[PDB]
Amino acid sequence: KKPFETVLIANRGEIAVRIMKTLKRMGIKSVAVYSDPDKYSQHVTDADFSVALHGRTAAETYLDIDKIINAAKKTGAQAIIPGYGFLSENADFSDRCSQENIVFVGPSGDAIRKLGLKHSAREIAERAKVPLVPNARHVEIQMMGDGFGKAIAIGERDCSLQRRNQKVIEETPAPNLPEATRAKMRAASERLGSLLKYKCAGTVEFIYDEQRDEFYFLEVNARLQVEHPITEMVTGLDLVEWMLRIAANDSPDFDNTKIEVSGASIEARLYAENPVKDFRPSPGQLTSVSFPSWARVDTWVKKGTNVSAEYDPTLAKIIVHGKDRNDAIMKLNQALNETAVYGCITNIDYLRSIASSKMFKEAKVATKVLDSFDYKPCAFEVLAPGANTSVQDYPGRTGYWRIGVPPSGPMDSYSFRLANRVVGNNSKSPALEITLNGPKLLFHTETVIAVSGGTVSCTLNDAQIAQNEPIEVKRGDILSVGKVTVGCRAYLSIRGGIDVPEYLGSRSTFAMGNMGGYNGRILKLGDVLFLNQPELSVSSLPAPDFEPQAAPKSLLPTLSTNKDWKIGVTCGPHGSIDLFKEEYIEQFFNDKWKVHYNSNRFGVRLIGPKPKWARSDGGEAGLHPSNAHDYVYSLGAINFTGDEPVIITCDGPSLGGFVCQAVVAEAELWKVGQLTPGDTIQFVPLSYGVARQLKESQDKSIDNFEEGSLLELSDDKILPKYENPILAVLPKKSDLSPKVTYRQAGDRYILVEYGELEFDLNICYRINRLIHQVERHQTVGIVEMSQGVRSVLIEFDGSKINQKALLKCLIAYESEIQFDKNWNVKSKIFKLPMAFEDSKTLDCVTRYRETIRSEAPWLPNNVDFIADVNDIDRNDVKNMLYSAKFMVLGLGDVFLGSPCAVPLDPRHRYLGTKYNPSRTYTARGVVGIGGMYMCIYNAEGSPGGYQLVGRTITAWDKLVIGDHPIDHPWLLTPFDQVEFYPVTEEELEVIIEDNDNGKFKIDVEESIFDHKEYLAWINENIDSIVAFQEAQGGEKADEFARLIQVANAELKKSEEYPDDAELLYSEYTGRFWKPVAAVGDHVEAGDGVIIIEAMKTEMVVGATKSGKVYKILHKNGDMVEAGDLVAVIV
Template identity: 45%
Template sequence: MSIHVERPGMLTTIQDWPGRVGYWKVGVPPSGPMDDLSLRLANVAVGNPEGAPALETTMSGPALRFDDETVVCVTGADAPVTVNGVPAERWTPITVPAGGVLDVGAVSGAGLRMYIAIRGSVLAEEYLGSASTFTLGTFGGLDGRVLQAGDDLAPADSATGTPAAVPMEHVPALTHSWQLAVTEGPHGAPEFFTRTDMDTILGTDYEVHFNSDRTGVRLVGPRPDWARTDGGEAGLHPSNIHDNAYSVGALDFTGDTPILLGPDGPSLGGFVCPMTVVAADRWKLGQLRPGDTVRFVALEAAAAASKNTVGLARRASLPVVFSRGGDGDDGVIARRDGLTPVTYRRSGDDNILVEYGEMSLDLALRARVHALHEAVEAISPAGLVDLTPGIRSLQVKVDPDVLPTAKLLDLLVEAEDALPDASELTVPSRHVRLPLSWDDPSTREAIQRYMHGVRSDAPWCPWNIEFIRRMNGLESVDDVYDTVFDAEYMVLGLGDVYLGAPVATPLDPRHRLVTTKYNPARTWTPENAVGIGGAYLCIYGMEGPGGYQFVGRTTQVWNHRHPLTAKGFEEGTPWLLRFFDRISWYPVSTEELADMRADLAAGRGAGVEITDGTFSLADHDEFLADNDSSIAEFRKKQAEAFGIERDAWSAAGEFALTTAQGA
C-alpha cells in the first residue's frame, strides 16, 4: 500500500512530537510541529500515539490518494476538506476508501497550518532520534525536504487506540487577534530594556510580518529605547550580548526587530530576549499568520498550564491566561554574590539560564560554565531535557511536569556550592587547522544581495573587511588578514547559527577583533562562510540568514550524509568541532576550497588537520599576565576606534533605525 502525493500543498512536511530532543548544544533544533497541539490531537483522533509522525502543511493543503481504505484526521487552521469531492469534517476521524483522494484546500479562516494524521502513521527517515523534517539541514521526514507531486509515502503500523472525534471543548480556539502567555526574562529591565520598554512590549498589539516561517515569527512594532548604549565586547547595538542559549518561544530582539523563535530556530545567539512564551501556549506560534495581531500577557511561571496536558485535560478553547501581572522579578529568579557572581534567569516555564560574572569575555567564566555543565550532567535528575552552554552561561531545560523550575533552582544552587575552583580547569583541546578562502566570492555575493534586497546604506557595506579594519583601528585590511591567520580561536559554543557552527574567540586578546552584527540581518549566507560578530568568530553550518561580518569561507563543519568516512568526523557525530577545540587557519584559493568541499561531500579527506592536546586555564592566565602591558595597549587603541565608530553611528541616526525585517 502507498499514499500518493497528487498535489503537495504548501511547505508540507513530516513532523513528529516532541521532535529532535537532546542536541540543542550542538545547534540541532527540535523541529517537530509548529502547532504541537493540533498534531497531537489529530494523532489521538485516529488512534495513534500522540507524537507519531504526521503531516504539517501551510496555507494550502495537499491532495493524497490512498491505495487502501484508510482512517485520517485533519486539524489545525480553518480549511475545506473533501474525500472524493465530498465535504468532510475536521477534528474527527474520516474514512478514505481504497483509491480515494483526500483533498485539503486553502485556509479560509483563522490560522495558518493544518495537520493530517493517518491511522498507523507514515514511515519516515529517523535522524538523531526523530522523524521530524528539518528542511534547512536536509534531514528527517522524506529526504529532509518538503513533499513534492509524485512522492509516495509508505504507511506505518503504530496505531494503538480506537479512533474517536476530538471533543469540542478540546478544539483550540483560533483567531486573528492572539494573546500569548509569557514569563518575563531572561533579559529584562533595568539591565537591558527600560521599564517603559517592558510596559510597551506588554501593552502593544504587534503585527505578524509576512517574512515569518518555522525559524521565527517576525513582528512589527515599536522600537525599544534600550537601557544601554551598546553591547560592549558583544557588539555595537544594545541588543547584542555574549552568546547564550535560546528557548523556543523566546521573543528575540535581533537589533530592533522582535522575533518569536520557532522550533526550527537557532539554539545559540547573541541577542537579548525580554519575554518567553510559556510551553503550553507555544502551539499558537504555528497558527500566527501575516496581518494577525499579537498581545503578550505576563503570567506567573507557577500558573503556567502543563504542556503535556494542554488540550487533552484542559479546555484549549478557553483563554490560557488565568493569572496576570507576571512574577514581578524582571525575569531574575535569584542572584548570588561571591568571587564569581551568579544570576539565575527565567526563560519560560521550562528553562533556567545560569549566568556567571559581569558582562565581559572571560575564559574563567566559560570554565565555570563547563564545571556546572558536568556537575548537572552527572546528577542527571529526572525531567532534565537539555544542557546548552554559552559564553558565560548554561541553559538548563527541563520538563516542568517532572522537574519544576523552583525545584531545579534548588538543585542548581546545591551544585554550585560543590563546584571546584575554575582556575584548576584542564580540558581536552584539539588543534584543528582549517583552510580559509579569504574574502571568498560567495561572501561578496551575499553582501551584494544584502545591499540590493535588504539595506544598501549599512556602515559595513560594501566590504565587511574594511568595516572590521575601521572598527578596530587597524592601518590596513592586510592587518585584518594577518590578525585572523595569526590567531588561535577557542571554541566556546556550538550551534551559534545551527549545525555544529562554532562561536570561538582568540586565546590571545591582541587577536580579538571586535565588530558588530548586521542590523537588519542578511537573508542569505553561504554555507561555511566565516564571520566575526562582537569578539567572536563563527563558521556557518549551513545556508541561511546571518549577521556576522564576513572574512572568508571554509570547509564543512557539519556532514550528516557521510559522517563515517569524511576526514575528521566520528561515528554518530556529524559535527566536526568540540567544545574547547582550538581553530587556526591556513590560506587557500577559491578553486582549492571548492575541490576540498567536493572531496568532503564525497566522504574523502578535505584539508582538515586535527592534533590532540589539552588546554590549561592556569597556563593561559600566566600567558595573559606575561603580556599584560601589550594587551592593555591593544585594547586601548581598539576601544578608541570602537568609540569613534559608535559616535559616527549615533550622529547618522543608526541606533534610531527601524525596520520590519529581522536583524
C-alpha cells in the same frame, strides 16, 4: 599460478567492485577507470591504481577505446577485463587489445562478430546441433571455454522474471525442468562453445516450453552476465577467477573438472527506480544503507553515495543460497525485508511483493508474468505538493539543543496531536504539516485520515469532508486540502503514521539541514509515501493505541477570528532594566505587534515599537545595545536582533548573540504556529505556574480525550504587570568564583549567567564544572544543559522538579564547584581551509543590501567595517583570520554545531557588531565575526547576524562520512581550537566537493589546552596585550555605536490592460526584490518574471503561458500583498 600482475577493469559500478575482490584475493594489482560523476565511487577507492578518463557520458568515457587502452598503457596493465555492458561485446575493442599486446579477458573479436549478428549466430548453432525455433521461459546455460576447443557447462539459470524484457529476478537451478532436457541443454552449449574454440565465459540463452518439454536457441552473450553470482553460490566457483586463469592460458583442466551443484540460489536486482511512476530512474544521495550481512550482496554503494541518472540505476544485487528452492525463496524474502536503502526511490517494495507472490512460489514464472503483475504500494502519492508540506513528529528531534539541532516537529503542536489522536495513533506517529495550502494525494491502499488545525476546505473524491473526524479512505481516493482561511497551518494524520527513517531519534523534517522527514525536504509532485498496514508491512512504526474518534469539541483550540491574538509568555531572560528602559518593557506588553512577511519555521518576525536601551552599546560582544555575549536561547524566546524582534520557533536558532525579552509559554507556542503576515498579537504576562497549568491541560486533553479538560488563556490567568525575570543574584566572591545571575527563561528553563558582561576563559571552565556537579548529583528533572560563552541554559521537566526547587539545587551545587587557575581540558585542534571574501560570502551581503537594509554603518562591505571601527587595514583583518587561534566556547551559533569561538590572543579581538536586523540567508561554510566572536555557519540558508569575512567547509557532517575521527555529525566541541589557512575560491570549491564525499582529510589533532601554560603566555606578552587594550575604543567607535543603533526604515505602505492578457499575481506577501525578465521579453510557460522575498525565500513569480512581457508593476523595495497584480504578459 598468478595469471597476471596488474589487471585493468574496463567498467564501473558493482561489477568493477566485484572483479576487484577477486583480484585482491588473488594478489593481483587492480586498475580502476572512471568518468567524472564516478570519481567518488567504491570501485575507484577499492583499486590499487586509477585513471581518470575525463567527461560525463558513457560515450565520452567508458566507451572510448582510445582512452581505455591508454589507461592500461599508462598503468602497465597486462590485461583488461571488461565486465558486461560497455566495451564488453565490442570486437574492435577485443581486437585493439590484441593488436596492442594487452590480453582482453574475454573471447576473440571474431567470436564476438560471429555472435553479434542474429543470423551468423543461428548457423553456428545449427552446425553445433542446437535445437532452434522452427508461455515462454528463459533458461540459460553458463558456459566456460578455454579458447582451444574445450568447453564446459557450469549450470543453468532461469531468467524468466523480466519486465518489458529487463531482468529483475533470477534463480538456479531452473525450476520444473527434467534432467533429460537439462543434460541436453548442457551438451548443446558445450558443442557451441567447442565449435567456436570459445574463450572465457559465455552464456547460451534458450526459450523453454515447460509444457511441451522443449527448448530453443535464442542467443549467446559473449561475456560474463549480471546474474552470474547465483551460479557461484551453487558451485562455489569464482567465475572471474576462472576467466582470468583461462585468459592467461593457465586454464583449469576441463576434462577433469567435476562440478557439483549444491542447493538453490536466487538474486534480486535493487535499482534506483520508481515502480509507481513507470520505473523512472531516481537519482540522489543515499542517506542510510543497510544490507543483510549473511546474504551475498554485490553492490558499490553505502551511506553517502551519490547515485546518478547517467549510466544505469543498479544499486545492489542481493543473493541468497538455500538448501532448495523453498528455503531460498524464504531466504530471499528475509533478505529483502532486511534491506534498508534510503535517499533514492528504490524498487525494494516492488521486489518484496514479487519475492512474496503466490506466483513466484508456485513457480508459475514466464517471460511474460511481470508485464501483467498486480503491483500495489501500501502508500500514498503526491498528485500536487501544497506550498510547504512536511512529515513531522512530536515532540520532535529532542536531545540536542546544546548542539543547535532544533526539535523541528509541528509548529502548532496541539492541532498536530489532536490530528494524531483523532485517528487513534500512538503519539509518536508521524503526520503531515500543511502550511498555507495543502497537497492533493492519491491513496493506493486503505486507511483512516483526519485533518486538524486551521480552517481549510478538504475534499475526498470531491465531496467536502469534516475536520477533527476520522475519515475512512478507500484506494483510488483523492484527498485534497486547499487553502488555509483561518490560521497558517493544518495537520493531516493517517492511521499507523507515515513510514520514513529516523534521523537523530526523530522522523521530523528539518529542511534547512536536509535532515529527516521525506528525504530531508518538503513534499514534491510525484513523491510516494509509504504507510504501516500491519498485515502488508515490515515496519518499526508504533502501532495505533486507540480506536479512532471525532475530537470532543471542547478540546479543540480556539484560533483567532480576526487576525488578532493574545499570546501568553513568561517574562525573561532580559526584560529587566540592566538592558531595556522601564517604559520600553511597558510598551512591549502594552502595544500590539504586527507579523512581518519574513516569518517561517526558523522564527516569526514582528513589527512594532522600537526599543529604548539601558546601555549605550554591548561592548566586546558587539556595539549594538541588543548584542549579548552569546548564550543559548529558549524555544519561544522573543529575540531582539538589533531593533526588531522575532519569535524563536521549532526550526529556530539556539546559541545566539542578542538579548531575549520574554518567552512564549510552551503551551502557547501553538498560537505562534498559526500566525500569518499581517496578524496582530499582544504578549500577555504569565506566571510559571499558570504556564504549567495550560501545558498539563493539553496533555490530559490528549491522553484521556474527554470533554472539558482543556484550559486556555483567560483574564484571571494573567499577571497584572510584567514581573522581574531575575530569580536570584549570587555576589562575586573571588577571582574564579564570579557573581551568578539566575534568569527565568521560559516555562522550561533557567538561564545561569556568570560574571559581569564580560568574557573570561575561567568562566568557561566553570560552566563545564557546574554541568559536572549536576551529573554527580544525578539530579532528577533536568533535561539538558546548554553551554554558552559565560552562561548555561538549564532545561527542566516541571512534572519532575519545579522552578523554585531547581533554583535552590543550582545555588547550592554552585558552592561545590572547586578548581584552580591551573586547569586543563582535552582540546581538538582543527586546521581549516578558508577563502577570504569569496563570491558566495560577498553575495550574501549583496542579497542583504537588496532585500532588507541597503545602508548601514557595516555596509556595503563587512570587512571594511571591521577594519574601520578598529582603525586597521582590511588586510590586517585578513591577517588575523589566518593567525588567530579560535577556541570554541559553545555550539549551534547558529545551527548544526556551528561554533562560537574567541581568539586566544586578546590582541585578536576586534570591535564590531551583529546585524541590525539579522539576515535571513547565509551560505554554507561562511565564516563570521560578531563583535569579537567568530562563527562558521554549518548550514546552507541560515539566518545570520555576524559580519561576513570568508568561507570554509561546514563543520557539520550530516551522515558522518567525512574523513576525520569524529563519531557524530557535529565536528567541534567546546574548548576545541579552529585555525584558518588561506585557499583560493576555486581551491575551496574542490575541497568542498571532496569533503562532501568523504575524500578530504580534515587536519585534526587531539591535544590538551592548559590554562597554566596559557596564563604564562599572557605574561610573556602582557605588555603588548595591555597597550592593545587601552587603545581600542574612543570617540570613533562611539559614533559607530550611535549610527549602528538607528532602527531600519519602516517597510513601504502598499489603469486599463489589453483584453486577453495573462494577469500575474503573487501567491504570497513579500517585498519586491528584483525583476527576472525585461518588458518586451518573450517568455515561455514556467519562465520567471519577477522575484519577491516572501518567508525568507527567494520567490519567483512566473509566466502561466508563453508571451511577451507587457508590464512589470513593482520596483525594488515595494511591498507586495498576496493576490496583488505583479506583471502582465501580452
